[PDB]
Write a protein that binds this ligand. Structure first.
Ligand SMILES: CSC[C@H]1O[C@@H](n2cnc3c(N)ncnc32)[C@H](O)[C@@H]1O
Ligand SMILES: CSC[C@H]1O[C@@H](n2cnc3c(N)ncnc32)[C@H](O)[C@@H]1O
Lengths: 235, 232
């Protein structure tokens, strides 16, 4: 397809810089505190947004990206804290869906993590997921697919981590933007998929590990997005 | 001037929607915005839905599609200040996320990277609110309002908020996301909400009993505030 535009969202400069550097005929849109780089990745039109950290920042950015750029699909990239036992720093996690691990209106009968007016979780697009898995296989990378949960806190072991494992025993990774992006996408009916890499395991060593392994995570997730954009656009 | 107003629930915005004349409706991103005049003042009323993301998406659409000069966030809230009773008013001096924590990276508790630790509400909007409160003989408290994506009802939830923000006068779920979006677009804002519960273990029961009263009181304050801002 020669008419599609793939949207990509990363929260930090370290997470979008590799991709930004590969954009052909790049230009930059500066709006509401966010930056969006337009151009093409090996011929495929893309709109890469640096959203900032956290749920609100990502929502605000995701909304602007959809409104000003109208991408057909959205891919959220960057690093995450690994929760699945087989995950090691560098490994890829693909979202089957996204849920807020810090949303709680259970007092009114909603299931934990669900906000009023929203489904309890947001489902990633089946085709995007299948495409991401193909890339994972073609690149011979270790990955895990499943539930990714977001919140506005950096998980670093202790109660923060345990509470999450307890409410979401099946969660494979934790971060701070995916569910806000999926929430916005859901409201606009835009297909999305989260493809991040592991930089820590959200335990008490998470900050030490994050600082040490963010670059390798950025590299691996960036490689995956580059490969995914190509696959989604031409097969 | 065009005054932006944001409420989360139908119950919080319905009284106001009923008063908007030359009324039109914008439906987008799962949100509804009612435009027109309120007692002779141009307004844009957004029903955002509950939570930070819904409020952030809503506020972003409102600014971009309606470009109001200022924003007023209304609705009910859980009172934390000792002198608040159900129905009373809380006015924001400032808004802070009570559930944001990146302190592992040196940011202040509640502060997200790239943002000020707190979002200061507009002095003139605050002054005007305080004027209406005095003119209406209402009981109110002004100060820090904290937002999170959890309904607070005693226990650990309430204890953690008391620990990090002992000066918080109220707690709710949209104010700071709205302040955060307004910050990014240089738009003045203020929070004027009415109490429906005191965020203790009986907060769900109080909420259900008093949301109607809180919606009414908050709606009246907004109506008076809008009129004062546009006509003295
Ligand atoms: C510096 S704040 C952490 C940033 O990296 C992601 N992240 C990586 N590991 C973690 C973790 N263990 N807890 C929370 N967010 C994480 C988040 O989405 C946010 O953009
Ligand atoms: C049904 S979820 C509660 C809704 O009312 C407000 N609210 C009122 N009291 C409280 C409370 N005690 N804790 C959290 N949000 C509250 C929130 O902003 C949200 O829109």
């Amino acid at each position: 397809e020669f008419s599609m535009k793939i949207g990509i969202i990363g929260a930090m400069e370290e997470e979008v810089t590799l991709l930004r550097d590969k954009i052909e005929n790049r230009q930059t849109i500066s709006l509401g505190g966010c930056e969006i780089y337009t151009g093409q990745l090996n011929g495929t039109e893309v709109a890469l947004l640096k959203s900032g950290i956290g749920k609100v920042a990502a929502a605000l950015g995701a909304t602007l990206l959809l409104e000003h750029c109208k991408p057909d699909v959205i891919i959220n990239t960057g690093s995450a804290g690994g929760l699945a036992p087989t995950l090691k720093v560098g490994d890829i996690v693909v979202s089957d869906e996204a849920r807020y691990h810090d949303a709680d209106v259970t007092a009114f009968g909603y299931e934990y993590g669900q906000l009023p007016g929203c489904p309890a979780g947001f489902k990633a697009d089946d085709k995007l997921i299948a495409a991401a898995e193909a890339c994972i296989a073609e690149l011979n990378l270790n990955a895990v697919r499943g539930l990714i949960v977001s919140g506005d806190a950096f998980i670093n072991g202790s109660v923060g981590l345990a509470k999450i494992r307890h409410n979401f025993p099946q969660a494979i990774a934790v971060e701070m933007e995916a569910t806000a992006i999926a929430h916005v996408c859901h409201n606009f009916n835009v297909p999305f998929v989260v493809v991040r890499a592991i930089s820590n395991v959200a335990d008490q060593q998470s900050h030490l590990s994050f600082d040490e392994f963010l670059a390798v995570a950025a590299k691996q997730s960036s490689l995956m997005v580059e490969s995914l954009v190509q696959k989604l656009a031409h097969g």
